[PDB]
Design a protein around this ligand. Sequence first.
Ligand SMILES: [Mg+2]
Ligand SMILES: [Mg+2]
Ligand SMILES: [Mg+2]
Ligand SMILES: [Mg+2]
Ligand SMILES: [Mg+2]
Ligand SMILES: [Mg+2]
Ligand SMILES: [Mg+2]
Ligand SMILES: [Mg+2]
Ligand SMILES: [Mg+2]
Ligand SMILES: [Mg+2]
Ligand SMILES: [Mg+2]
Ligand SMILES: [Mg+2]
Ligand SMILES: [Mg+2]
Ligand SMILES: [Mg+2]
Ligand SMILES: [Mg+2]
Ligand SMILES: [Mg+2]
Ligand SMILES: [Mg+2]
Ligand SMILES: [Mg+2]
Ligand SMILES: [Mg+2]
Ligand SMILES: [Mg+2]
Ligand SMILES: [Mg+2]
Ligand SMILES: [Mg+2]
Ligand SMILES: [Mg+2]
Ligand SMILES: [Mg+2]
Ligand SMILES: [Mg+2]
Ligand SMILES: [Mg+2]
Ligand SMILES: [Mg+2]
Ligand SMILES: [Mg+2]
Ligand SMILES: [Mg+2]
Ligand SMILES: [Mg+2]
Ligand SMILES: [Mg+2]
Ligand SMILES: [Mg+2]
Ligand SMILES: [Mg+2]
Ligand SMILES: [Mg+2]
Ligand SMILES: [Mg+2]
Ligand SMILES: [Mg+2]
Ligand SMILES: [Mg+2]
Ligand SMILES: [Mg+2]
Ligand SMILES: [Mg+2]
Ligand SMILES: [Mg+2]
Ligand SMILES: [Mg+2]
Ligand SMILES: [Mg+2]
Ligand SMILES: [Mg+2]
Ligand SMILES: [Mg+2]
Ligand SMILES: [Mg+2]
Ligand SMILES: [Mg+2]
Ligand SMILES: [Mg+2]
Ligand SMILES: [Mg+2]
Ligand SMILES: [Mg+2]
Ligand SMILES: [Mg+2]
Ligand SMILES: [Mg+2]
Ligand SMILES: [Mg+2]
Ligand SMILES: [Mg+2]
Ligand SMILES: [Mg+2]
Ligand SMILES: [Mg+2]
Ligand SMILES: [Mg+2]
Ligand SMILES: [Mg+2]
Ligand SMILES: [Mg+2]
Ligand SMILES: [Mg+2]
Ligand SMILES: [Mg+2]
Ligand SMILES: [Mg+2]
Ligand SMILES: [Mg+2]
Ligand SMILES: [Mg+2]
Ligand SMILES: [Mg+2]
Ligand SMILES: [Mg+2]
Ligand SMILES: [Mg+2]
Ligand SMILES: [Mg+2]
Ligand SMILES: [Mg+2]
Ligand SMILES: [Mg+2]
Ligand SMILES: [Mg+2]
Ligand SMILES: [Mg+2]
Ligand SMILES: [Mg+2]
Ligand SMILES: [Mg+2]
Ligand SMILES: [Mg+2]
Ligand SMILES: [Mg+2]
Ligand SMILES: [Mg+2]
Ligand SMILES: [Mg+2]
Ligand SMILES: [Mg+2]
Ligand SMILES: [Mg+2]
Ligand SMILES: [Mg+2]
Ligand SMILES: [Mg+2]
Ligand SMILES: [Mg+2]
Ligand SMILES: [Mg+2]
Ligand SMILES: [Mg+2]
Ligand SMILES: [Mg+2]
Ligand SMILES: [Mg+2]
Ligand SMILES: [Mg+2]
Ligand SMILES: [Mg+2]
Ligand SMILES: [Mg+2]
Ligand SMILES: [Mg+2]
Ligand SMILES: [Mg+2]
Ligand SMILES: [Mg+2]
Ligand SMILES: [Mg+2]
Ligand SMILES: [Mg+2]
Ligand SMILES: [Mg+2]
Ligand SMILES: [Mg+2]
Ligand SMILES: [Mg+2]
Ligand SMILES: [Mg+2]
Ligand SMILES: [Mg+2]
Ligand SMILES: [Mg+2]
Ligand SMILES: [Mg+2]
Ligand SMILES: [Zn+2]
Lengths: 174, 204, 37, 140, 16
Amino acid sequence: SRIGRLPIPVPKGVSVEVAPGRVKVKGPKGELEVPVSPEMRVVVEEGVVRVERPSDERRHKSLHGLTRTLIANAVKGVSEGYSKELLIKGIGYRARLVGRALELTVGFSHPVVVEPPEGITFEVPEPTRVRVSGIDKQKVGQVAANIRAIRKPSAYHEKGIYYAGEPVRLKPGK
Amino acid sequence: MKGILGVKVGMTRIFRDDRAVPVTVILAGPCPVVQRRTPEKDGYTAVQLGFLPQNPKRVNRPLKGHFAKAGVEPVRILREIRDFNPEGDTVTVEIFKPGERVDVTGTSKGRGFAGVMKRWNFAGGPDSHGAHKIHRHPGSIGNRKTPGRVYKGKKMAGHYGAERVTVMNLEVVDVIPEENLLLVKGAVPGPNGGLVIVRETKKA
Amino acid sequence: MKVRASVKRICDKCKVIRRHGRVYVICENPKHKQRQG
Amino acid sequence: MKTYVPKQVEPRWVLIDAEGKTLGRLATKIATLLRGKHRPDWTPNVAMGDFVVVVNADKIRVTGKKLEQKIYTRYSGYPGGLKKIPLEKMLATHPERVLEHAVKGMLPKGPLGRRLFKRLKVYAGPDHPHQAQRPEKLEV
Amino acid sequence: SPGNCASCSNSASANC
RNA sequence: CGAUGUCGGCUCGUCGCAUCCUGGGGCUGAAGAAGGUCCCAAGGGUUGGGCUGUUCGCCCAUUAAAGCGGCACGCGAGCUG
RNA sequence: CGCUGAAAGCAUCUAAGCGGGAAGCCCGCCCCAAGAUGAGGCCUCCCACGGCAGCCGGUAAGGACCCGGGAAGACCA
Ligand SMILES: [Mg+2]
Ligand SMILES: [Mg+2]
Ligand SMILES: [Mg+2]
Ligand SMILES: [Mg+2]
Ligand SMILES: [Mg+2]
Ligand SMILES: [Mg+2]
Ligand SMILES: [Mg+2]
Ligand SMILES: [Mg+2]
Ligand SMILES: [Mg+2]
Ligand SMILES: [Mg+2]
Ligand SMILES: [Mg+2]
Ligand SMILES: [Mg+2]
Ligand SMILES: [Mg+2]
Ligand SMILES: [Mg+2]
Ligand SMILES: [Mg+2]
Ligand SMILES: [Mg+2]
Ligand SMILES: [Mg+2]
Ligand SMILES: [Mg+2]
Ligand SMILES: [Mg+2]
Ligand SMILES: [Mg+2]
Ligand SMILES: [Mg+2]
Ligand SMILES: [Mg+2]
Ligand SMILES: [Mg+2]
Ligand SMILES: [Mg+2]
Ligand SMILES: [Mg+2]
Ligand SMILES: [Mg+2]
Ligand SMILES: [Mg+2]
Ligand SMILES: [Mg+2]
Ligand SMILES: [Mg+2]
Ligand SMILES: [Mg+2]
Ligand SMILES: [Mg+2]
Ligand SMILES: [Mg+2]
Ligand SMILES: [Mg+2]
Ligand SMILES: [Mg+2]
Ligand SMILES: [Mg+2]
Ligand SMILES: [Mg+2]
Ligand SMILES: [Mg+2]
Ligand SMILES: [Mg+2]
Ligand SMILES: [Mg+2]
Ligand SMILES: [Mg+2]
Ligand SMILES: [Mg+2]
Ligand SMILES: [Mg+2]
Ligand SMILES: [Mg+2]
Ligand SMILES: [Mg+2]
Ligand SMILES: [Mg+2]
Ligand SMILES: [Mg+2]
Ligand SMILES: [Mg+2]
Ligand SMILES: [Mg+2]
Ligand SMILES: [Mg+2]
Ligand SMILES: [Mg+2]
Ligand SMILES: [Mg+2]
Ligand SMILES: [Mg+2]
Ligand SMILES: [Mg+2]
Ligand SMILES: [Mg+2]
Ligand SMILES: [Mg+2]
Ligand SMILES: [Mg+2]
Ligand SMILES: [Mg+2]
Ligand SMILES: [Mg+2]
Ligand SMILES: [Mg+2]
Ligand SMILES: [Mg+2]
Ligand SMILES: [Mg+2]
Ligand SMILES: [Mg+2]
Ligand SMILES: [Mg+2]
Ligand SMILES: [Mg+2]
Ligand SMILES: [Mg+2]
Ligand SMILES: [Mg+2]
Ligand SMILES: [Mg+2]
Ligand SMILES: [Mg+2]
Ligand SMILES: [Mg+2]
Ligand SMILES: [Mg+2]
Ligand SMILES: [Mg+2]
Ligand SMILES: [Mg+2]
Ligand SMILES: [Mg+2]
Ligand SMILES: [Mg+2]
Ligand SMILES: [Mg+2]
Ligand SMILES: [Mg+2]
Ligand SMILES: [Mg+2]
Ligand SMILES: [Mg+2]
Ligand SMILES: [Mg+2]
Ligand SMILES: [Mg+2]
Ligand SMILES: [Mg+2]
Ligand SMILES: [Mg+2]
Ligand SMILES: [Mg+2]
Ligand SMILES: [Mg+2]
Ligand SMILES: [Mg+2]
Ligand SMILES: [Mg+2]
Ligand SMILES: [Mg+2]
Ligand SMILES: [Mg+2]
Ligand SMILES: [Mg+2]
Ligand SMILES: [Mg+2]
Ligand SMILES: [Mg+2]
Ligand SMILES: [Mg+2]
Ligand SMILES: [Mg+2]
Ligand SMILES: [Mg+2]
Ligand SMILES: [Mg+2]
Ligand SMILES: [Mg+2]
Ligand SMILES: [Mg+2]
Ligand SMILES: [Mg+2]
Ligand SMILES: [Mg+2]
Ligand SMILES: [Mg+2]
Ligand SMILES: [Mg+2]
Ligand SMILES: [Zn+2]
């Protein structure tokens, strides 16, 4: 029934150093800084990072759970890494990689060419399935969201860009 | 941002691809540079251009020393082109080639004291049906006790024209370097003989 | 989006939240989306 | 006896670092310096306050949501000519006006008050050109 | 007109 | 009440926004197209004519649209009457 | 409309933080503008005149007056 007090397992060898209002997480896949409220305290133990709040007032309880997850996400980010998948659906709809870029054919009068931000890598296996990959979890989700917005699921037809595991809830037409 | 000083000479029309293109003809160069405005010295970037030779017997000592430091013959007009730094020390019509687009700044023709119908295209009054001495009059100029005054900027009679006008995005139809001539499609502010400034367009 | 002075839950899936000084009712049924105003 | 009136004094020059100080609470003291009410010979109808140089005016501080919500206002006289500039943008364009506007509204209106405003010299950034006057650094 | 005789102010010339 | 000229039209604007159009939206009993309803938005735009003193209204032909109100039922030391 | 995300093990556009997004807002374009008395800046010219922050005079660089005019203009400019 609590997230802030949940100890953070740390794989080996990802290192986590604490600094005023920022923790620095270094791992195999890269590095990430996590800006932390000075009101919390981040504690490093044997292969385990922990966070403590100074009181039980709501701003401290609210910051507490947040701060633990932000650090846990960076630790998973530099070791496992993060990724999201997108499923293209629709008859003429497909995707292909061009250099490091992502080119979308989703029913417009033109292709749509998405360029990967620094720290993000695009891969197209099947021409109908895209995977967004990176070490920053928010950044991975942001890019994935950006791509999906180019052609959202239709309300009436199984056409458009879909999240992997996104239900197909359609409504009748005539 | 290229620019050059010039004099409006007059209008005609030429024929280009079985079309008649109205042109106004501008005698642009040559424009010697007499001073450069640097960010270190002046806070901005510009060239002071000279234009049209002047009888040295007419040029006072303060001006004559300005020309001296430039190594330039006395000239009748000095105007700056902002954000223009030409490689040479002389600017000529050949900074424009046909097809480019320009903005031309002149002093419009001066109508003196212009009534409200010429200056602001007001509708005047009726010319019959009882209209009493108000045929060219502007009508109401306000409300009543609220606000009991007349807006700043109210359109009223007064001097009109003889003011700076820039007309923009004019196609350069031709340039005749042999004669410092510059043909431009359309109309340009001011009278024949007026001084004009020709600048690369700011439209895209 | 319904916009009204009385924002209430309509079904058991409706959720009352507070975004940027305003009260919303978000829900999986798009008709149940409400903003107070 | 009659109340002592001073002969013309030599004004003091004074330096203040505005960094991190609250806008209104700093302006209150600068106003007091400007009026000279910190002097035991304060006369209400002449200028005898100090000259006040202020640095780092761009790093003045404010509470609440005032960066977004404090609106400076100017009226041109023309129809529809009420302009509105929030604190944020005023700070990002003419940061010295934020302090100047606050001190200005805390000075007396009239000729003397206008002169006293001229004895304020507000600068953004850590430096000022009045080295010649050798201002005494004040703590407020 | 005020003038003539139904009204009586603001509106016509001398007569009195 | 030792006078604060009274409808409408014309002229000239200017403001409000409870928005007629144009721009941005959510919901739709939204297939598409076209609507409905609500939200944001006052930058600009908001036609010509027949009838009547008319304001309004009806009608004709169009329109992206033919918005509603305030300014002494805006404005007669500006006109009309 | 989102991303990430607690309080509240889930969920949440938000409480920390980050995106997208209007003919509207700020710039950008055109014109006025240092009486902006906070009277700005740059280039050039004259200069240490003779008499008891002041006075009277002769000048310097310059300017005005007068005149011939002007697609400038009521006069003025
Ligand atoms: Mg001719
Ligand atoms: Mg040709
Ligand atoms: Mg033709
Ligand atoms: Mg000339
Ligand atoms: Mg001209
Ligand atoms: Mg000119
Ligand atoms: Mg002229
Ligand atoms: Mg003309
Ligand atoms: Mg007229
Ligand atoms: Mg006309
Ligand atoms: Mg005209
Ligand atoms: Mg006109
Ligand atoms: Mg005009
Ligand atoms: Mg008319
Ligand atoms: Mg008419
Ligand atoms: Mg007429
Ligand atoms: Mg007539
Ligand atoms: Mg009559
Ligand atoms: Mg009359
Ligand atoms: Mg007549
Ligand atoms: Mg009139
Ligand atoms: Mg009145
Ligand atoms: Mg009236
Ligand atoms: Mg008034
Ligand atoms: Mg004039
Ligand atoms: Mg003009
Ligand atoms: Mg064109
Ligand atoms: Mg020639
Ligand atoms: Mg939900
Ligand atoms: Mg005494
Ligand atoms: Mg203080
Ligand atoms: Mg003090
Ligand atoms: Mg004082
Ligand atoms: Mg005093
Ligand atoms: Mg604030
Ligand atoms: Mg008072
Ligand atoms: Mg009478
Ligand atoms: Mg009465
Ligand atoms: Mg009387
Ligand atoms: Mg009276
Ligand atoms: Mg009377
Ligand atoms: Mg009276
Ligand atoms: Mg509204
Ligand atoms: Mg409003
Ligand atoms: Mg309504
Ligand atoms: Mg609309
Ligand atoms: Mg729309
Ligand atoms: Mg809609
Ligand atoms: Mg149904
Ligand atoms: Mg249908
Ligand atoms: Mg549709
Ligand atoms: Mg709504
Ligand atoms: Mg509007
Ligand atoms: Mg308005
Ligand atoms: Mg309107
Ligand atoms: Mg009509
Ligand atoms: Mg008829
Ligand atoms: Mg009619
Ligand atoms: Mg009618
Ligand atoms: Mg009426
Ligand atoms: Mg009727
Ligand atoms: Mg009827
Ligand atoms: Mg339409
Ligand atoms: Mg219609
Ligand atoms: Mg109305
Ligand atoms: Mg009223
Ligand atoms: Mg109106
Ligand atoms: Mg009424
Ligand atoms: Mg009535
Ligand atoms: Mg009335
Ligand atoms: Mg009206
Ligand atoms: Mg009358
Ligand atoms: Mg009337
Ligand atoms: Mg009236
Ligand atoms: Mg009146
Ligand atoms: Mg009257
Ligand atoms: Mg009156
Ligand atoms: Mg009559
Ligand atoms: Mg009659
Ligand atoms: Mg009658
Ligand atoms: Mg969601
Ligand atoms: Mg979420
Ligand atoms: Mg926040
Ligand atoms: Mg944003
Ligand atoms: Mg987005
Ligand atoms: Mg446009
Ligand atoms: Mg706005
Ligand atoms: Mg100018
Ligand atoms: Mg000046
Ligand atoms: Mg100037
Ligand atoms: Mg002057
Ligand atoms: Mg001022
Ligand atoms: Mg002064
Ligand atoms: Mg002064
Ligand atoms: Mg000065
Ligand atoms: Mg000056
Ligand atoms: Mg300067
Ligand atoms: Mg002389
Ligand atoms: Mg003359
Ligand atoms: Mg004259
Ligand atoms: Mg004359
Ligand atoms: Zn519901």
